[PDB]
Amino acid sequence: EGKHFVLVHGACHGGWSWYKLKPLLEAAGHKVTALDLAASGTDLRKIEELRTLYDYTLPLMELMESLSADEKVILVGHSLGGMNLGLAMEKYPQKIYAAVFLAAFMPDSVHNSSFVLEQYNERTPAENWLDTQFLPYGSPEEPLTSMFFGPKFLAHKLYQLCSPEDLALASSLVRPSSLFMEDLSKAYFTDERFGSVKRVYIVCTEDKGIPEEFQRWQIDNIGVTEAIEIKGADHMAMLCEPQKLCASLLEIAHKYN
Amino acid sequence: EGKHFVLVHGACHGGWSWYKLKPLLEAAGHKVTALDLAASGTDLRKIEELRTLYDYTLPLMELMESLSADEKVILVGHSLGGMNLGLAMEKYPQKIYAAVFLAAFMPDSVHNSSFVLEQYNERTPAENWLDTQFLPYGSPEEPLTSMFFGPKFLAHKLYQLCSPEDLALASSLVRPSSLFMEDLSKAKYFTDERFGSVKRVYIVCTEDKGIPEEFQRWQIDNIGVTEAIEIKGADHMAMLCEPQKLCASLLEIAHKY
Amino acid sequence: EGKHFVLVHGACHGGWSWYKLKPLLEAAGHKVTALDLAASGTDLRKIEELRTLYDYTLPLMELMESLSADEKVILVGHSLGGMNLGLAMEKYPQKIYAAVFLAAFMPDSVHNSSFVLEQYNERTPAENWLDTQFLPYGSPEEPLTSMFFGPKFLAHKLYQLCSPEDLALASSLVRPSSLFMEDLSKAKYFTDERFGSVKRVYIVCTEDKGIPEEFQRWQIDNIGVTEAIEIKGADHMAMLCEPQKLCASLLEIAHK
Amino acid sequence: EGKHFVLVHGACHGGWSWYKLKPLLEAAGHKVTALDLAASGTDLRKIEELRTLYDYTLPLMELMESLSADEKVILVGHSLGGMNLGLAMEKYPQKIYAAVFLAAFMPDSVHNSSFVLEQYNERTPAENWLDTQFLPYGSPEEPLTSMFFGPKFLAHKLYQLCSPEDLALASSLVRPSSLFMEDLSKAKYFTDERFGSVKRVYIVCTEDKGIPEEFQRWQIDNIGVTEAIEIKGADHMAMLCEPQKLCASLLEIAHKYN
Numbered sequence A: 001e002g003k004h005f006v007l008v009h010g011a012c013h014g015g016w017s018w019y020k021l022k023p024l025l026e027a028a029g030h031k032v033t034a035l036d037l038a039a040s041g042t043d044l045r046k047i048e049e050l051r052t053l054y055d056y057t058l059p060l061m062e063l064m065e066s067l068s069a070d071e072k073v074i075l076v077g078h079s080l081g082g083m084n085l086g087l088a089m090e091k092y093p094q095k096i097y098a099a100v101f102l103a104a105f106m107p108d109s110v111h112n113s114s115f116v117l118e119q120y121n122e123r124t125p126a127e128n129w130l131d132t133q134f135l136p137y138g139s140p141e142e143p144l145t146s147m148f149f150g151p152k153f154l155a156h157k158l159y160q161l162c163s164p165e166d167l168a169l170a171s172s173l174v175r176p177s178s179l180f181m182e183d184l185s186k187a188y189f190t191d192e193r194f195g196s197v198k199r200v201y202i203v204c205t206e207d208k209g210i211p212e213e214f215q216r217w218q219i220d221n222i223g224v225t226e227a228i229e230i231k232g233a234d235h236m237a238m239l240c241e242p243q244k245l246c247a248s249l250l251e252i253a254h255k256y257n
Numbered sequence B: 001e002g003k004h005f006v007l008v009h010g011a012c013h014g015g016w017s018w019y020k021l022k023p024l025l026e027a028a029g030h031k032v033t034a035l036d037l038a039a040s041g042t043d044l045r046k047i048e049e050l051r052t053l054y055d056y057t058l059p060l061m062e063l064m065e066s067l068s069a070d071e072k073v074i075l076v077g078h079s080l081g082g083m084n085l086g087l088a089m090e091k092y093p094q095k096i097y098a099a100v101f102l103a104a105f106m107p108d109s110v111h112n113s114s115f116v117l118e119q120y121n122e123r124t125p126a127e128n129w130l131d132t133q134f135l136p137y138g139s140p141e142e143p144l145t146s147m148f149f150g151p152k153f154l155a156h157k158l159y160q161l162c163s164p165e166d167l168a169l170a171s172s173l174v175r176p177s178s179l180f181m182e183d184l185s186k187a188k189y190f191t192d193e194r195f196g197s198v199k200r201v202y203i204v205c206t207e208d209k210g211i212p213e214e215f216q217r218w219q220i221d222n223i224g225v226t227e228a229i230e231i232k233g234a235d236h237m238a239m240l241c242e243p244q245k246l247c248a249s250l251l252e253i254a255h256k257y
Numbered sequence C: 001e002g003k004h005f006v007l008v009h010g011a012c013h014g015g016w017s018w019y020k021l022k023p024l025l026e027a028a029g030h031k032v033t034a035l036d037l038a039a040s041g042t043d044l045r046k047i048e049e050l051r052t053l054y055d056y057t058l059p060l061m062e063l064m065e066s067l068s069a070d071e072k073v074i075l076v077g078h079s080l081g082g083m084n085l086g087l088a089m090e091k092y093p094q095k096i097y098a099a100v101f102l103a104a105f106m107p108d109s110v111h112n113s114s115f116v117l118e119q120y121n122e123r124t125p126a127e128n129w130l131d132t133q134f135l136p137y138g139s140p141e142e143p144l145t146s147m148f149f150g151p152k153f154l155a156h157k158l159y160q161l162c163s164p165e166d167l168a169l170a171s172s173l174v175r176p177s178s179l180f181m182e183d184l185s186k187a188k189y190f191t192d193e194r195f196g197s198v199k200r201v202y203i204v205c206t207e208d209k210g211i212p213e214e215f216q217r218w219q220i221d222n223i224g225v226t227e228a229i230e231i232k233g234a235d236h237m238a239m240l241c242e243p244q245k246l247c248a249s250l251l252e253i254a255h256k
Numbered sequence D: 001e002g003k004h005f006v007l008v009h010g011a012c013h014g015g016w017s018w019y020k021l022k023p024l025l026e027a028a029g030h031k032v033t034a035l036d037l038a039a040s041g042t043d044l045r046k047i048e049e050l051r052t053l054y055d056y057t058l059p060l061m062e063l064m065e066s067l068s069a070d071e072k073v074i075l076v077g078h079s080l081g082g083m084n085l086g087l088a089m090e091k092y093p094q095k096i097y098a099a100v101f102l103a104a105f106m107p108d109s110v111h112n113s114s115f116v117l118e119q120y121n122e123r124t125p126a127e128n129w130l131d132t133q134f135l136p137y138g139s140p141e142e143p144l145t146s147m148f149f150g151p152k153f154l155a156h157k158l159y160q161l162c163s164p165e166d167l168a169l170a171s172s173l174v175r176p177s178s179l180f181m182e183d184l185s186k187a188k189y190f191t192d193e194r195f196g197s198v199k200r201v202y203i204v205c206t207e208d209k210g211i212p213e214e215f216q217r218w219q220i221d222n223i224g225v226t227e228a229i230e231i232k233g234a235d236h237m238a239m240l241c242e243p244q245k246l247c248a249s250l251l252e253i254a255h256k257y258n
């Protein structure tokens, strides 16, 4: 017994975001890896050095490749992290017990890889972004845009139910990121590989960054093997409701054996 | 009469370490700045780029110069942050209401600047470092050495009285640092006229195993302070295991003399 | 190939003062930045907003901060611009190939930061200032004084050997400045480890009547210089009366 | 005794632009005032504080107000400066020997005050502006637009015949201004009785690429002038590329219009 939980943070965050969850999963006798994606957390890479979703996901790809033949894992993707899980599932489908999407963007091998992002962008008026910074770092021929959450956006849309301490922590650690729309519109997931992995979506009822209605929409339109929900949780469930999240994850681990 | 508290982290940490304290001071109606020093927290610089204490303190020096004309601050330095405070005190003595040393290294204006650090290493057994890594990144004629706390040293000497969540956060954010001994041993950066003119306050953390209470008292007895406060039961990371008491202490000294 | 020259104007002037030199340096294949310091040239800040030498030097500090990872520059400071140079040298010592002080005030890390200015003020008789305006805008708690060159001081002491067009240009562009005496007398801007680790070069202007050749020589002897070059026949505004020689001199010390 | 020349710069420029011409006129024994209009040159006001041509021309109006009345002047307006000249001619017509429009915008009393600006734009392609910046700074119910020449625009449309030194100088001194289209379209300023009672001289710069010769001749032909002078081989910045030719022309008008 004892599974391996691979936790993948969202945009503008890093492995640190799982600091309240990690200890809980370990106490239950499980292995946990809360990695930093490229240019995230304490990774020295710069966001301008990332031109594709792959570059950004590289760290996860390297970890998945180091996994022992008999060391299956439970991938947990938060927010944009869901897109990162897609590449891992497409390349290492049989190394995944189940893919868990925590208030994340969950892709599929049916629509265009950027579909869920495009739908989100359309149902999201510019004002909702508040003080988020969107800046170009590519070229008119090869357009690249970076996304960097501002303090207002973090407090009103992502941490409205989190403690003032959690907000202070995030405000001193958030770094520029990117939705990698342009890159994702050029294609990356197939039925045979990506579509063979069980998907479990965890809904955060009070989520304002990625509203509950949009999460439901993804469950209905994209489809999942199972849908769970953490009532009273905002976008940052691993911070405002770590124990509930842990319980859910452990239940997933027991079920998808 | 709101106050501007400038919080300065210790070696291997960053502004994020003050995430529990910051909200408490602000709730009390004060302004707080928890900056990242060079190659710390999310700062993109690498430790190998820092050769002196000044290079490392650069972010603090920039903050001091950005201060309004008639705007003073209360400096709070933790651990190695005490040395950073020394440089700011020597350069902008009139811009500081008081310099608070929290379980920190506190220099003097009599011996060379590396004095207390040499005294610390000489009164503290090598075995106390546990898994901390000391690596050279300079040359035989221009020596440079980086210091990186390992998981054992962090859990056994710094966070022994902190929660498992706090230890998890530190393990995912810690980065290599340096005591900059080489640089500091070759000069006397502090003078009684500037550095020594700044009001000094020391906060002793009785259960500290990183910088033992005995050494803290020794530093106090080496130069003297305007006031010595004590936080009984706090380990090296007082802002994490005793944020409320620390906040109260800072609010008190914020009107003592 | 080709270097980046950062030109820093003196008191009451601005980036425009390098309009004759800038083209020459670029013609040689070099990048030139003739920035405006705070409350100078077309900058919108007012003199009463600058309380310290750092506030005045802010634009130079931002420029240095925006420099590429492995991008170095050659600083050229004129007149008061030398003091601005010192701050840049102290903060970014390793991004500077050499600091050129063109008939400028050049500090050291030994005495007070205002040392050379205090010495200058003690040799310079009140008569020499002519119609220059000195007005206070601070308080005894922190004394502040603005300095504004008058048309006569400009014509007799700074532009006596310059063309009538250049004098007209200056008269329509000069703005109040400050020597920041009091701020400097209590600050510790320069240290031997940083400011003093940067190669120093001094270009003396023989016919200078603003900062006389003797005072220029004194500063050179006071702290020492890696190389001291001289532009014979140039008044205080060497980039206006002798731009070509200045360019040649700068391209020479650009490696020698 | 020598006359008083009041030099009025164009948009994004300042008194400094007349630095080569000023000495020439003074050498001739004449008095010269190269003032800075509002938010121009070293003026501390910002373009966002100006919403009408009148606010922008304030400095000129203040200067005209201090004239002894027994002391007349010769107004020389360059580029957009010609519009500033109009307000002075309207308010102090009897204190002006003549108004000189150097490759400027010369208004009339018949059409809307923005007439010449509207015409200019109608025969000027949106690409002639190059890297020039047009930013809005007026509230939704009170539209206001700022104009800021870019380096390319200066080098290829205004200073194509000037020295590299003058381009370097202009680039380090240009500031944002405005054509004040909004204000000029609803505010009637000039009248035939006053503005029109002043003699107008237009100096054409044949090589002008900012305000092309054709439009300059268009204004002379449509708006009318007392006399038309021409400076062959000069770009938009005649006071920089041909200061001596311009000075001779000004001294000439200063003599026949006394």
Ligand SMILES: *[C@]1(N)Oc2ccccc2C(O)S1
Pocket (backbone or CB within 6 Å): A009, A010, A011, A012, A013, A078, A079, A080, A081, A158, A179, A209, A210
């Ligand atoms: C994730 N961490 O949070 C949000 C919130 C709102 C919109 C996008 C995103 C991400 O891409 S990541």
Ligand SMILES: *[C@]1(N)Oc2ccccc2C(O)S1
Pocket (backbone or CB within 6 Å): B009, B010, B011, B012, B013, B078, B079, B080, B081, B179, B210, B211
């Ligand atoms: C500080 N953060 O913690 C410790 C602990 C033990 C020895 C040195 C140090 C520092 O320099 S920093």
Ligand SMILES: *[C@]1(N)Oc2ccccc2C(O)S1
Pocket (backbone or CB within 6 Å): C009, C010, C011, C012, C013, C078, C079, C080, C081, C179, C210, C211
């Ligand atoms: C410099 N531009 O010119 C002079 C001349 C005489 C005395 C002081 C100064 C400056 O501070 S700046």
Ligand SMILES: *[C@]1(N)Oc2ccccc2C(O)S1
Pocket (backbone or CB within 6 Å): D009, D010, D011, D012, D013, D078, D079, D080, D081, D179, D210, D211
């Ligand atoms: C004048 N200085 O230059 C130009 C050039 C082209 C179009 C307009 C204008 C001005 O309004 S001012």
